[PDB]
Structures are given as C-alpha cells and as structure tokens.
C-alpha cells in the first residue's frame, strides 16, 4: 500500500454531526442565544477564508421554512461566550436562499464577507432573530453547513494541527 503525505492544511467542512459543535432550540424574538455553537478543538487551528460559502437550512417543528424576514448572524466571540463587534461575518436574512439549489448552485451560494480565524480555544456563534407571533426553530431538522469540499466551486475550511507547525502560535496571535 501507499498513501500520499497530504499537506497539513487540510480542506474540510462543518456540519451538525461533529463533537466540537452543538445546537439547541429557539423560540421567537430571541437574539441573545446561539442557536448553534462552535468551538475550537484542542491543539488545532481552523481557518475560514473570506470567500467561504455559508448555508443555514433551519426549519420549523412541523417541517416548514420560517418567516424570511428572520435574520441570521454568524459572529466570532472571545472566550466565555463574549461576542465582539469586529470580526463579525454573514449578517444575512433567512429568506433569499432557495434551499433547494443553495449549495448546489454557485449563484445561490452565499459566501462570507471577510476572513476569519479560530484559535485553539475560541467560539463562533450563530444568533437568530425571529419576529414575534411566529413559529420556533426545531433542532432536529435545522442544520448549518459552511465550506465547500467536494466541488470545484466554492472554498473549503482550512484546518491544521497546532503541534505540527512552529509559526502556528504566531498565526494564532496574529488572529
């Protein structure tokens, strides 16, 4: 057998069924909570470029799409669930995706605005603003995906083991 020594900067993507991610249900008129939480695993470094695709595909408990006036906001945080204004990306509305062809089509493929980085212990949150008198989010059917592996279109999330590279700490301090 033979396998190629693939580069440390591995091309990956994020989704629900992973250990360093979590979600929880949401009601209405309810900005403060992360519907979805992400955290940096230990001794790893994640990198999200500016042209990274984004793809929330939330649902209602009865299996429906929500009010497109709903808003989604990805946002970096300092440790301790402490958000920060700078570094925010993807302040979008829940409408205007066409989930059917969303990831499928590079046109519909909504990318981020600016670059981003996740040091080994950091947080990225996904806040949601639903107008009142509306249905709530259901975590069983909701989903997030970011990055585009497995396609000549779109970009992919970079990852690297912190212990391999020597300037990994330099890039971590650089943020």
């Amino acid at each position: 057998p033979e396998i190629g020594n693939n580069g440390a900067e591995k091309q990956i993507s994020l989704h629900k069924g992973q250990p360093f991610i979590d979600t929880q249900d949401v009601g209405a008129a309810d900005p403060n909570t992360p519907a979805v939480t992400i955290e940096g695993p230990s001794d790893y470094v994640i990198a999200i470029d500016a042209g990274t695709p984004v793809a929330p595909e939330f649902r209602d408990a009865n299996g429906d799409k929500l009010d497109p006036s709903t808003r989604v906001t990805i946002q970096k945080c300092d440790k301790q669930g402490n958000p920060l204004g700078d570094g925010i990306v993807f302040s979008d509305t829940l409408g205007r995706f066409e989930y059917s062809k969303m990831r499928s089509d590079p046109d519909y493929m909504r990318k981020t605005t600016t670059s981003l980085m996740i040091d080994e212990r950091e947080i990225v949150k996904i806040f949601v603003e639903v107008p009142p008198n509306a249905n709530g989010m259901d975590a069983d059917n909701s989903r997030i995906t970011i990055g585009d592996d497995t396609s000549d279109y779109g970009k992919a999330v970079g990852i690297v083991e912190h212990g391999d590279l020597s300037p990994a700490e330099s890039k971590a301090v650089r943020q």
């Binding site: 009010d67 497109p68 006036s69 808003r71 509305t93 409408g95 605005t113 600016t114 509306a134």
Partner: protein
Amino acid sequence: QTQEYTINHTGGVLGDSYVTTASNQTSPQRETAVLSFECPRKFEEINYVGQRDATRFVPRTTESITGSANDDTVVDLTANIQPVAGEEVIAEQDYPVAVAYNVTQGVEVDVVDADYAADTVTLGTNPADGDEVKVWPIMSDGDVQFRLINQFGQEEGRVYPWSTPLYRWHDFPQLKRGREINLHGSASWSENETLEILLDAPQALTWEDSDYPRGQYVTTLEQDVEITL
C-alpha cells in the same frame, strides 16, 4: 473598521425604533415615503454605493371579495399583474405571485394560474357564499427612489435622479450575482440622519396584516450597506 451588512424593514442592527414604515396614498398620486432608516446614536456613519451593494424588495397589496353561491374560482383585480420573473406556472416561481386566505376556513388557498394580461387571477378552491376572503397579489406600475434627510425633515439632496420601476424590479430574477440588481448613486450619512425609501404608485401596498400565512410581515426590503462600526 468597515463591514458589509444587510438591513431589513424591521429591527436588525437598528432596534425597531429608528426604523419607520408607512403606506402610500391612492387618490393623489404622490411620491410618498414608505420606509425610512435613521442612523442611530451608536454608529459613526453609514455608506451606500451602487454597483457594489445588492438589494431585494418584495411588495404586495391587499384586496377582498365577497362569497357568492356561484362558483367563482376567479377574481379580477385593481392592479396590473404579471408573473414573478415571467412564467405561466405556479410553484416554479421564486415566490408566489399571489396568496389568498379564507377568514372562515382558516387555511391557505392554492393558485392554479392566471391570464397575467388583464387584472385577473384564478383560484383553485371553491369559496362558499358569504365567506370572507383576502388576497395579497403582486404589485405593479410604480416607481421607487431614495432621498436623504438632515435630522429635520429637510432634504439636502437625492441619491439618484431617475426612478427605477418596481415593475422591472419584479421582472428581473432576484438574488443572482451577475443578474443581481444594483442601483446607482453613492450616498453617506451620520448620526440621526435619515434615508427615506419612497414610492410613487397607485395601488395601496401593505406591511402588516396579522392573518397572512407565509410569514408575519407581508412585504419586505433587504438592502446591503457598508458601516463604519
């Protein structure tokens, strides 16, 4: 410093106070002000650029009928009508051209088709006599534009002289880069200064009805902007 956000007809980054909505006027055709956004205390300034910042604006109207014994299955309208980006077919559109709701039977009502030439639309169901109905068809035959206000209701300028028709606005398939809409003009303002989004059209649009199935707020605006923190 600088970011690229979206702003909506409600809340968002502002907080539902320094937005305000309003309907148009029908009998005097006048350049009403249907929406306006006031730069809050906390920001430093807001910018706005054409051919850089995307946009979306889905308006509608409201009309009503009266149930009758005769099997109507069709209603005329008071508004020019066309399909969403053109097609005879329903459920292929980016969104429904029209929605209908029965007060008695608290249920949605599908749509089959329409002539799309005269002010006409078909209903798939068979309304009963005496039943109350509401419908939120597409809107047409209008103009939209921008202007700035310096804290006083006192205009200083205009973003772009020539109005763009909402008719055309519906005609283009939205939310496609390359085919995305991008107006002209390069505006910028600061604290407590307002951008007004203005309408010139006959038919009475809506913002809220409290009995509309596909979301609470019927119409919507979603504009890209650049902000200095």
